[PDB]
Homo-oligomer: A and B are copies of this chain.
Amino acid sequence: DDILLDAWDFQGRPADRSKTGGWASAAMILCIEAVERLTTLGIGVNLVTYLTGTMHLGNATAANTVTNFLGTSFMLCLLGGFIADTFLGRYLTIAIFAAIQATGVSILTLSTIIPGLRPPRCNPTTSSHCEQASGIQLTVLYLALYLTALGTGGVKASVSGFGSDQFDETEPKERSKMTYFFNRFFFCINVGSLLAVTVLVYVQDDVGRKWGYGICAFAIVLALSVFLAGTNRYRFKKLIGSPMTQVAAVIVAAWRNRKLELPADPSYLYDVDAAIRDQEAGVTSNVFWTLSTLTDVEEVKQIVRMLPIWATCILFWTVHAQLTTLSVAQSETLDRSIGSFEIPPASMAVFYVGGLLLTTAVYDRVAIRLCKKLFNYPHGLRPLQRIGLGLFFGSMAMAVAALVELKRLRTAHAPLGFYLLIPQYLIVGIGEALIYTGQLDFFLRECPKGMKGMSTGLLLSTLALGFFFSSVLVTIVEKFTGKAHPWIADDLNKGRLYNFYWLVAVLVALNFLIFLVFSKWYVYKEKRLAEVGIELD
């Protein structure tokens, strides 16, 4: 009754419901997730200008550095979950990796303080050119960045899952205590994330970096000690396995044997074909690294059916990557003067965060029940309709964003203009709050049974590439016409951005038509396969 077979406590003796439980104890875990999100935002959003305001980089190579650090921090999150799942706990994953996050962000705060560890002070845009940055002073910014990248990476992966282990016995009153707890919790993260792209951005911009990154490092060192102090209060998961494992064990363990085709149709052992090898194409099997089992082989193959739609997602995230880097540099040249108020350059990102929060809010009330009464589905847009939708806004921003780099270059070649960068922030914002619903929802129900959780893998990995390809996309345009003014600049007025924003708009516009064809097809095949699996028994 009171004791559960579902979890154990920090001893290992079976967990109890009125000893280990989350009306309180779920907070001490989760505050880490709060300080972490609030970090890679307050840092990541505005990391771009630190490199162009102090490190004195060229507005181009500040973008690549940031999108890479960002994308890197997204690859490393994909790994942390595999480590939580294969090797360490959920728990000592989030315990180990918050401590790591802490030194990275300490080494970072440190790098902005100790003297001569940043090039002597001055302003690059419209003013001067200074010192570059020493090869010494660039290596600590890297290690610290990349350490932070790794830290935020690992806990982003497991701190969420662990905090919810603190509630759900299938029993309702706990599930009620839980659902009660979180709707009150996210309003915070929301209202609190709105804080970090404004208030926190305000500090590192006005007061200075040391304080700005300092209040961060202190937050994780505070949080981690709250977390650990709750250790005994917690009840513990048994190591959910990463499904990414057998994907490795057929993509590889069917590679190590490439030999006689052996089509007898199917030979059996329990579920096995001996041999089993990957031909893609089709067969079908149902059941309940040396050699591989066929019912295992096929499950991988369903993962592969999802791959082309997986591909067409990457480019949205490139559009999103432009919001954190370039739209800052062109908020660097704009007005932003409210009189006695001067709004922080990278704080334009509050618009993007707004269109997230707002869209989600409009889409949970307005657009859900408006389908059950309108059509056969009360699910809203399930799933790939939201994905396609997002791709379209991917261009719609990059297209508008390309338009506004003209109205800006207009007035600045011949003083005051601003509030023209809302749309591109907003549009990527609304566009994001749909495509991430859709990417996710699709990756779930369409992921095989027992092998799902492959989802976040497909999800995050697209994020990562989105940034990495936005790194590549920038590095290509360097050679198109490289002399004179290419589309990149330092004084942006001495160069032209719109020529990039267009190309992303177009590259994405095409990407979306592609997605449409991939979308029509994928369902024709995953239907025919269903129907064929039956006809042949």
Selected contact of A110 from candidates B100, B106, B218, B225, CB within 8 Å: B218
Q: How far is the CA of A231 from the CA of B94 in the complex (A)?
A: 13
A10 x B92 contact (CB < 8 A): yes
**A 192-218 contacts with B by CB, 8 A:** 218
B88 x A232 contact (CB < 8 A): yes
> Residue among A221, A225, A227, A232 with the most chain B CB within 10 A?
A225
> Which of chain B's residues has its CB closest to A113's CB?
B214
Q: A88: shortest Cβ distance to chain B, in Å?
A: 7
A229 x B96 contact (CB < 8 A): yes
Contact with B along A96-130 (1 / 0, CB 8 A): 10011011001000100000000000000000000
Q: How far is the CA of A137 from the CA of B110 in the complex (A)?
A: 25
Q: How far is the CA of A92 from the CA of B9 in the complex (A)?
A: 13
A523 interface hit (Cβ, 8 Å): no
A221 partner residues in chain B, CB cutoff 8 A: 99, 102-103, 106, 221
A12 interface hit (Cβ, 8 Å): yes
A188 partner residues in chain B, CB cutoff 8 A: none
A50 interface hit (Cβ, 8 Å): no
A224 interface hit (Cβ, 8 Å): yes
A229 partner residues in chain B, CB cutoff 8 A: 96, 99-100
Q: A152: shortest Cβ distance to chain B, in Å?
A: 14
B231 x A100 contact (CB < 8 A): no
In this complex, the interface size class of chain A, counting residues with CB under 8 Å from chain B, is 20 to 34
Using A10-B88, A231-B88 as known contacts, say yes or no to A222 and B95 having CB atoms under 8 A apart. Answer: no
A228 interface hit (Cβ, 8 Å): yes
A142 interface hit (Cβ, 8 Å): no
Q: A221: shortest Cβ distance to chain B, in Å?
A: 5
> Residue among A12, A87, A95, A229 with the most chain B CB within 10 A?
A95
B228 x A96 contact (CB < 8 A): yes
B225 x A99 contact (CB < 8 A): yes
A100 partner residues in chain B, CB cutoff 8 A: 225, 228-229
A103 partner residues in chain B, CB cutoff 8 A: 218, 221-222, 225
Selected contact of A232 from candidates B10, B87, B227, B231, CB within 8 Å: B87
Q: How far is the CA of A221 from the CA of B221 in the complex (A)?
A: 8
B10 x A12 contact (CB < 8 A): no
Selected contact of A95 from candidates B12, B87, B218, B228, CB within 8 Å: B228
A88 partner residues in chain B, CB cutoff 8 A: 10, 231-232
Q: How far is the CA of A232 from the CA of B229 in the complex (A)?
A: 20
Q: How far is the CA of A147 from the CA of B95 in the complex (A)?
A: 20
A228 x B92 contact (CB < 8 A): yes
Known: A95-B95, A99-B229, A110-B218. 11 other contacts (CB 8 A): A10-B92, A87-B232, A88-B231, A88-B232, A92-B228, A96-B229, A99-B225, A102-B221, A102-B224, A103-B218, A106-B221
Can you give 11 A-B contacts (C-beta < 8 A)?
A10-B92, A88-B231, A92-B231, A95-B95, A95-B228, A96-B231, A99-B228, A103-B222, A103-B225, A106-B218, A221-B221
- Which 7 residue pairs are nearest across A and B when measured between Cβ atoms? A99-B225, A96-B228, A103-B225, A99-B228, A99-B224, A100-B225, A103-B222
